[PDB]
Amino acid sequence: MNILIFGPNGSGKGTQGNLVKDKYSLAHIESGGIFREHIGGGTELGKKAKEFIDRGDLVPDDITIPMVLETLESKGKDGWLLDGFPRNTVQAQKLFEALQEKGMKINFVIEILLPREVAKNRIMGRRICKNNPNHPNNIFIDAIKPNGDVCRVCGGALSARADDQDEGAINKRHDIYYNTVDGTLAAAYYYKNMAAKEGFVYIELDGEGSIDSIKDTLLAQLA
Amino acid sequence: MNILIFGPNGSGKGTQGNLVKDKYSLAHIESGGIFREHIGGGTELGKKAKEFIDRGDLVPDDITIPMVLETLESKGKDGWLLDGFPRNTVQAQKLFEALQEKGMKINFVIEILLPREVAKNRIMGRRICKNNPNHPNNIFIDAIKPNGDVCRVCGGALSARADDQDEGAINKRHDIYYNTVDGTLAAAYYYKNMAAKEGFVYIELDGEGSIDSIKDTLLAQLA
Amino acid sequence: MNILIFGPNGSGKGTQGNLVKDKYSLAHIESGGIFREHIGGGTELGKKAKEFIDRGDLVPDDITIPMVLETLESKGKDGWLLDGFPRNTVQAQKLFEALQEKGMKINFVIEILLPREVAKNRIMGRRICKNNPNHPNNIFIDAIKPNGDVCRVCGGALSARADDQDEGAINKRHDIYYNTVDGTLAAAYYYKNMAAKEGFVYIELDGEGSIDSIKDTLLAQLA
Amino acid sequence: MNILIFGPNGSGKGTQGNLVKDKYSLAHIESGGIFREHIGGGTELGKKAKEFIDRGDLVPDDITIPMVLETLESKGKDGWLLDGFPRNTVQAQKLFEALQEKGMKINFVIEILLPREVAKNRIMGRRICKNNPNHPNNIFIDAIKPNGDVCRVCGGALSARADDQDEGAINKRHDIYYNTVDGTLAAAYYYKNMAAKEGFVYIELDGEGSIDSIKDTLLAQLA
Numbered sequence: 050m051n052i053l054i055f056g057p058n059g060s061g062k063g064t065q066g067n068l069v070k071d072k073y074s075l076a077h078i079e080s081g082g083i084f085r086e087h088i089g090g091g092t093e094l095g096k097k098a099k100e101f102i103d104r105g106d107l108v109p110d111d112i113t114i115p116m117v118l119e120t121l122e123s124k125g126k127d128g129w130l131l132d133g134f135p136r137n138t139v140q141a142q143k144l145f146e147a148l149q150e151k152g153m154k155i156n157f158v159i160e161i162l163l164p165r166e167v168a169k170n171r172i173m174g175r176r177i178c179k180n181n182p183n184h185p186n187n188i189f190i191d192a193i194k195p196n197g198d199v200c201r202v203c204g205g206a207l208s209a210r211a212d213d214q215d216e217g218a219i220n221k222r223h224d225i226y227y228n229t230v231d232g233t234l235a236a237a238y239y240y241k242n243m244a245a246k247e248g249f250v251y252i253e254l255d256g257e258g259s260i261d262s263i264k265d266t267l268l269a270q271l272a
Numbered sequence: 273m274n275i276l277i278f279g280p281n282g283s284g285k286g287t288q289g290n291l292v293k294d295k296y297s298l299a300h301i302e303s304g305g306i307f308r309e310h311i312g313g314g315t316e317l318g319k320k321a322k323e324f325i326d327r328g329d330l331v332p333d334d335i336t337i338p339m340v341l342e343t344l345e346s347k348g349k350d351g352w353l354l355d356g357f358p359r360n361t362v363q364a365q366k367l368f369e370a371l372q373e374k375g376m377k378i379n380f381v382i383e384i385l386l387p388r389e390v391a392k393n394r395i396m397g398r399r400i401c402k403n404n405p406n407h408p409n410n411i412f413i414d415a416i417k418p419n420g421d422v423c424r425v426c427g428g429a430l431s432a433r434a435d436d437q438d439e440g441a442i443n444k445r446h447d448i449y450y451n452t453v454d455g456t457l458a459a460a461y462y463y464k465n466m467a468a469k470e471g472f473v474y475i476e477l478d479g480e481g482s483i484d485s486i487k488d489t490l491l492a493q494l495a
Numbered sequence: 496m497n498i499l500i501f502g503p504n505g506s507g508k509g510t511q512g513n514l515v516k517d518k519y520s521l522a523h524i525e526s527g528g529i530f531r532e533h534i535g536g537g538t539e540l541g542k543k544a545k546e547f548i549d550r551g552d553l554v555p556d557d558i559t560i561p562m563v564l565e566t567l568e569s570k571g572k573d574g575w576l577l578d579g580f581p582r583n584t585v586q587a588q589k590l591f592e593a594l595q596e597k598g599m600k601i602n603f604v605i606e607i608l609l610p611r612e613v614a615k616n617r618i619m620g621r622r623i624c625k626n627n628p629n630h631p632n633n634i635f636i637d638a639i640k641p642n643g644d645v646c647r648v649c650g651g652a653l654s655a656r657a658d659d660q661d662e663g664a665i666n667k668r669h670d671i672y673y674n675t676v677d678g679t680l681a682a683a684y685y686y687k688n689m690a691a692k693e694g695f696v697y698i699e700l701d702g703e704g705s706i707d708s709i710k711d712t713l714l715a716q717l718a
Numbered sequence: 719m720n721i722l723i724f725g726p727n728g729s730g731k732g733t734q735g736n737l738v739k740d741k742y743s744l745a746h747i748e749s750g751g752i753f754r755e756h757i758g759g760g761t762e763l764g765k766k767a768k769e770f771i772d773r774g775d776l777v778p779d780d781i782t783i784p785m786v787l788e789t790l791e792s793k794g795k796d797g798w799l800l801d802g803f804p805r806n807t808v809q810a811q812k813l814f815e816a817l818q819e820k821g822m823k824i825n826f827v828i829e830i831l832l833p834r835e836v837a838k839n840r841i842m843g844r845r846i847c848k849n850n851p852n853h854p855n856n857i858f859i860d861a862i863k864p865n866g867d868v869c870r871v872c873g874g875a876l877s878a879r880a881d882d883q884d885e886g887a888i889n890k891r892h893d894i895y896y897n898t899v900d901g902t903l904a905a906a907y908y909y910k911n912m913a914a915k916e917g918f919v920y921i922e923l924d925g926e927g928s929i930d931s932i933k934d935t936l937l938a939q940l941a
């Protein structure tokens with residue numbers, strides 16, 4: 050079972066992917082870990098990639114796509130969940146052609162749907178408990194609203210994290226994710242639009258339902 | 273059902289208390305919220321307390337204990353869980369005499385047990401995920417160890433929180449908690465030692481078992 | 496030369512004290528360091544203090560005042576600057592009587608004056624540069640306003656610190672500082688009111704002028 | 719007077735540039751602000767750049783170099799200090815040819831020199847004072863070492879910032895800066911090597927001397 054997952058920052062995408070990967074014993078493959086395996090491990094592709102990174106340039110798609118496929122072959126032989134790549138349409142189509150050339154089949158593509166204003170507010174609304182950072186509090190998510198100014202689980206003090214309040218940075222990542230010309234939504238839709246012809250199932254998850262409700266609908270449509 | 277809960281920082285005490293209060297529909301009463309009700313709301317006891325606080329002195333026990341009892345009467349009429357008070361033996365005995373004078377019965381006292389070195393390491397070992405602060409990671413808790421330097425749920429970057437690394441502050445709170453002469457353990461033991469005579473049950477939870485395992489044993493011994 | 500300095504959080508008090516202590520080769524004695532010398536070093540007074548702290552009670556004034564005087568005798572024999580003690584009128588008068596009993600003379604008392612709303616806004620207005628935390632930026636201090644959303648020195652990204660945004664905590668410290676019944680301003684005024692009789696000079700610094708301008712007027716009135 | 723400045727993270731580069739720009743009334747032009755002027759202001763080059771950024775690709779040098787020159791013409795007509803661009807040799811040579819085509823002369827190039835291990839330790843050694851974040855403390859810089867665990871200016875508590883402790887991120891920026899094949903040092907040296915032929919002066923600042931000492935030698939060699 051091979052799955053691609055898409056969703057913006059603010060959509061709970063890591064949480065949902067973790068649940069799927071545990072249930073189906075999948076390798077969870079994330080674009081950052083691919084580079085550490087190849088750039089850090091000095092594979093022939095990684096030594097080639099690292100000459101771009103070390104000038105401040107990006108790695109070209111003709112090196113990145115073979116890296117991804119090498120990792121999928123190596124870590125994903127009993128099934129994989131690919132998270133965070135592709136980000137744009139050129140990458141999505143190069144990835145699809147590379148997977149076909151190696152006979153590697155996509156079985157599911159999952160997209161978590163959330164309006165961009167909702168996604169941004171969910172990130173900025175997070176409040177961290179001083180006593181235990183695991184305690185979920187979010188001023189913009191009714192089911193886990195704080196108890197006034199304090200933690201709804203234990204009554205500890207709450208604070209905001211500066212990176213969650215950095216609106217210029219949140220907006221530049223959502224700019225790319227929500228770009229339906231050639232950004233990540235256009236990439237997700239390129240897969241949606243060929244699912245029926247290519248024999249895979251495209252699953253749309255409504256990101257506004259609860260952690261439990263989303264997990265139920267998802268684990269039902271893969272089962 | 274009236275319950276007192278004790279445990280050091282690093283023992284998961286808020287999490288466990290929240291579970292108990294939800295299961296039994298208890299008011300969760302924490303020492304900080306008592307002051308906001310009385311100091312903030314200008315009760316006669318609160319206006320009296322606030323003259324000490326405003327000089328930098330502590331509120332005397334002859335004002336704090338009546339505050340606690342007024343809150344228990346007011347917010348806790350259908351059952352309460354009192355968390356974070358008493359902290360020492362003088363408070364514990366004044367509280368017991370005040371509860372007897374008002375005919376308010378203790379039904380359970382819960383103590384979460386953890387060695388102090390274990391408690392400190394659990395606090396300092398916490399690592400927060402950049403992508404989602406809910407994702408539990410802890411270098412000192414094997415079941416939720418990170419995946420190398422990254423989040424074990426989603427592969428996001430991890431960082432430490434400065435307050436979790438502040439060893440002088442952690443040690444001064446554990447100094448008080450673990451003081452068996454007249455600190456919080458001596459207070460917990462004052463209750464343990466009269467449980468049989470006073471007709472309440474003293475529950476000891478081994479804080480090194482999992483969130484699930486502790487919750488099972490606890491919810492079993494209250495049931 | 497012996498000096499007491501008073502000022503609220505938000506008044507630049509540490510900066511000014513450091514300048515005075517360097518110019519006059521004074522020991523800078525701060526209430527926190529007194530405890531580490533005595534509580535940490537197990538002086539007879541410190542072992543006595545630590546039994547209160549370890550129950551969660553404050554150290555009584557009849558132990559704290561002798562501690563302060565022992566430190567002044569020991570670290571301050573060639574002149575001292577005492578910062579952060581006394582905080583209330585009872586401490587201020589006990590300190591004055593203890594200094595007289597040991598023949599230790601006050602030469603100057605410095606008070607940095609700022610309206611409380613100004614002090615709070617100066618704390619909340621601080622913005623820290625990502626590239627270098629030394630670069631001063633403050634949305635509420637015109638001379639060091641940021642350059643739009645970025646550092647006015649180097650153009651780096653700016654963020655806020657959670658403790659600078661914690662209005663409940665800022666307000667509880669200003670509650671004590673600005674309490675003119677028996678809090679820290681009442682303590683400062685107790686000294687002001689006896690300066691002429693006791694042969695010391697009381698210096699009032701207008702905390703709204705620049706770091707340079709305040710330093711000039713101050714170093715002039717001590718010279 | 720037109721100046722290019724180079725230095726790694728950890729070298730005090732913003733501080734020194736600010737001093738030069740104030741003394742000579744220069745526009746301080748930093749690579750981040752160029753994009754906000756063009757990408758944010760929708761110049762014809764900026765609308766072109768933003769189509770790459772919105773796919774997650776970099777802006778090509780044939781768009782970035784004209785952007786830089788347009789900003790230099792517009793904001794830098796009475797003299798500029800260009801900070802943070804170029805980062806590699808291809809950019810450095812394209813920039814030089816673009817400046818020649820517009821008749822814009824370089825007068826000085828400043829390089830702040832520090833060994834990479836020294837630069838990393840200066841970043842990781844920073845400690846921020848709780849009372850005032852302006853107070854410089856650094857465990858790796860002897861002149862501003864803390865006073866034990868506390869602020870050397872005011873005795874306040876010290877903490878570390880997570881981004882200053884992120885060694886993978888520090889190393890990836892130093893990887894590019896210290897790359898003498900085609901990274902930022904190779905770019906700086908491309909200018910050094912033509913200074914005499916092109917009639918500009920290349921200034922090397924020893925980054926291990928004090929803020930004052932560096933500023934003196936620098937302001938002397940520009941004067």
Ligand SMILES: [Zn+2]
Pocket residue numbers: 178179180181184200201202203204205286
């Ligand atoms: Zn909490």
Ligand SMILES: [Zn+2]
Pocket residue numbers: 063401402403404407423424425426427428
């Ligand atoms: Zn995570």
Ligand SMILES: [Zn+2]
Pocket residue numbers: 624625626627630646647648649650651732
């Ligand atoms: Zn800066």
Ligand SMILES: [Zn+2]
Pocket residue numbers: 509847848849850853869870871872873874
């Ligand atoms: Zn300081």
